[PDB]
Symmetry: C4
Subunit: 74 residues, 4 copies
């Protein structure tokens, strides 16, 4: 059967239909990019506090040495 314009047109519509799926992917990965950026900022906030924990650890160690001092003094 001779190739016809309609055969080429069928491929055009197929590609344009595929393009709509590509468009959803692109919109979604851009949204994920923005959201991962925001997530990292929040992870940064958590990290900054996690070392406030290290100070807490030190203060508690100091409190223990003190409490032993109270008991040692009787």
């Amino acid at each position: 059967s001779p190739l016809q314009q309609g055969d080429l047109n069928a491929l055009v519509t197929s590609v344009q239909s595929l393009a709509l799926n590509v468009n959803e992917i692109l919109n979604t990965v851009r949204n994920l990019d923005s959201r991962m950026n925001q997530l990292e900022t929040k992870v940064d906030r958590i990290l900054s506090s996690q070392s406030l924990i290290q100070t807490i650890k030190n203060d508690i160690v100091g409190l223990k040495a003190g409490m032993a001092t109270l008991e040692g003094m009787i």
Copy 2:
């Protein structure tokens, strides 16, 4: 004169591209759902950071109060 079968390789190549794009779509929709879960859980972690500074303030009082006892 070109025949319908002369287009077969192009038709097949587009079918394969479409199958693989569809699998990307399936995966990125799953990444979107996973990101919802991660965001909710990180927000939960971030909220508990209020306890840390409360612990912080109380420990300041425990420090001063203990100096008082030590003075005795």
Copy 3:
């Protein structure tokens, strides 16, 4: 100019070249899926 087989073949190679980019995307999003699960 009459359409020739070489004109169709040019589009085939273009699509197959595009398919390699699609393949990298697919490999990478699957890897991201596994890594977000672990995260």
Copy 4:
């Protein structure tokens, strides 16, 4: 007889698909890099969780030691 120009719409549609796929590629490579950063920072957070249980154990001792003082 089909002419070269009869393929123009298909050529353009594939060019546009390729441009948009290229932008997906650019974005997903960036997501990969971002994920490296997130993974490293979450691993850092997870490591500090050792301090929490150390605080936990010490506080147990502070509890018992204080019961001692209260008796005294």
